[PDB]
Amino acid sequence: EIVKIPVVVHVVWNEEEENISDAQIQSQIDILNKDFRKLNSDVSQVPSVWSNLIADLGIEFFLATKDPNGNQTTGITRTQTSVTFFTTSDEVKFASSGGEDAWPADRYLNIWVCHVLKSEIGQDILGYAQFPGGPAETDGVVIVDAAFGTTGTALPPFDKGRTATHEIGHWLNLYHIWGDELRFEDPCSRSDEVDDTPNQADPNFGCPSYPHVSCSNGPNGDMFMNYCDYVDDKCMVMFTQGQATRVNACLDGPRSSFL
Ligand SMILES: [Ca+2]
Ligand SMILES: [Ca+2]
Ligand SMILES: [Ca+2]
Ligand SMILES: [Zn+2]
C-alpha cells in the first residue's frame, strides 16, 4: 500500500550554479523517501506526548524514468531561463514565462526548482505548492534550489530537504498547522483541519524550544516539529496520523491517479 510517486524535477536556472546537480536533486528525493515513510531518524525529536501520533504516510517518490511520451528520462529537466526570480504566480511552471511546463500532473509530481521565489507581496520564499484539485498545468511544488536537497547549493537551515517535504505536504492536501490566519483574524481561530495537530497561533520559525505554547495549547504547545509548520528543516520531523488521513483522502480522491 506504498504509493510510489514518480517525480519530475524541473530545474530552471539562470546562473549555472542554479542548475543544480543530480546529486543535489537525488538527495532531496532521498529525504522525501524518509520523511514520507517516517524513516527520518530525527523523528526521535518528536515530543513523547506526540510520539504515538507520528505517521508513516506510506508514500515514496522516485525520479521518473519515463517521460510523458514514454521516452527514457532521468526525471530531471533543466531549463535555462533569463528570468531572475519566480513567484507564486507560477511563471516557473510555463515555458512561455521562462520556466518549464508541467508534466502530466496525474502521472508525475512536478517539482520545479528555481533560484529565487517571491510571494505576491515580494517576500522571499523557499517554496510553494499547489493543493490538489488545481489545474494540471501548475500542479506540483516549487522549491528554491538553496532549500532543495542536502548538498550542492542547499544551505542551512534549509538543507535537510524539508522545504520539499513541507510543500509536498501541501501538494497532498495538508495545510499549515497554524491555520493561516490573516493578520486581522484571531490567531487561534483557524484550523488546519487536523485534530491531532494542536491549535496553534502562528507559524513557528527557526527552532522553538519545546513546549512552545500558543492558543492556550499548553502544556504540550505547538506541534512546531510538524512538517506543516515553518520551522527550520532540522526542527520538523513528522507528520501526524491525522495528517495522514488527509493525505490518504488526497491520494484516494483528487490524486488517485497515483494509486
Ligand atoms: Ca496560478
Ligand atoms: Ca489542528
Ligand atoms: Ca492559528
Ligand atoms: Zn507551506
Swiss-Prot record:
Q: Which GO terms describe its molecular function?
A: metal ion binding; metallopeptidase activity
Q: Which UniProt keywords apply?
A: Calcium, Disulfide bond, Hydrolase, Metal-binding, Metalloprotease, Protease, Signal, Zinc, Zymogen
Question: Which residues are connected by disulfide bridges in this protein?
Answer: C188-C215, C207-C235
Residues the record lists as binding Zn(2+): H166, H170, H176
| Cofactor, free-text remark | Binds 2 calcium ions per subunit. Binds 1 zinc ion per subunit.
Positions contributing to Ca(2+) 2 binding = D192, V194, T197
Q: What does the entry report about how pH modulates activity? A: Optimum pH is 7.5.
Q: Give the residues the record marks as binding substrate.
A: L126, G127, T163, D233
Record's comment on post-translational modification: The inactive zymogen pro-ulilysin undergoes calcium-mediated autolytic activation to the mature ulilysin. Autoproteolytic activation entails removal of the first 60 residues and of a highly charged 20-residue C-terminal tail.
Enzyme Commission numbers on file: 3.4.24.-
Give the residues annotated as active site. E167 (proton acceptor)
User: What does the entry list as the binding residues for Ca(2+) 1?
Assistant: W178, E181, P187, Q200, A201
Name one process (GO BP) from the record.
proteolysis
How its function is modulated: the record gives: Inhibited by EDTA, excess zinc, and also significantly by batimastat in vitro. Is not inhibited by other metalloprotease inhibitors like phosphoramidon, captopril and galardine or those targeting other classes of proteases.
According to the lineage, what is the superkingdom? Archaea
What cofactors are annotated for this protein?
A: Ca(2+); Zn(2+)
The UniProt function text for this chain reads: Metalloprotease which in vitro specifically cleaves IGFBP-2 to -6, insulin, and extracellular matrix proteins but not IGFBP-1 or IGF2. Shows a preference for substrates with an arginine in the P1' position, the first position downstream of the scissile bond.
Identify its protein family. Answer: Belongs to the peptidase M43B family.
Share the domain note from the entry.
Consists of two subdomains separated by an active site cleft containing the catalytic zinc ion.
Q: What subunit structure does UniProt give? A: Monomer.
Entry protein name: Ulilysin
- Species, as recorded: Methanosarcina acetivorans (strain ATCC 35395 / DSM 2834 / JCM 12185 / C2A)
Source species taxonomy: Archaea, Methanobacteriati, Methanobacteriota, Stenosarchaea group, Methanomicrobia
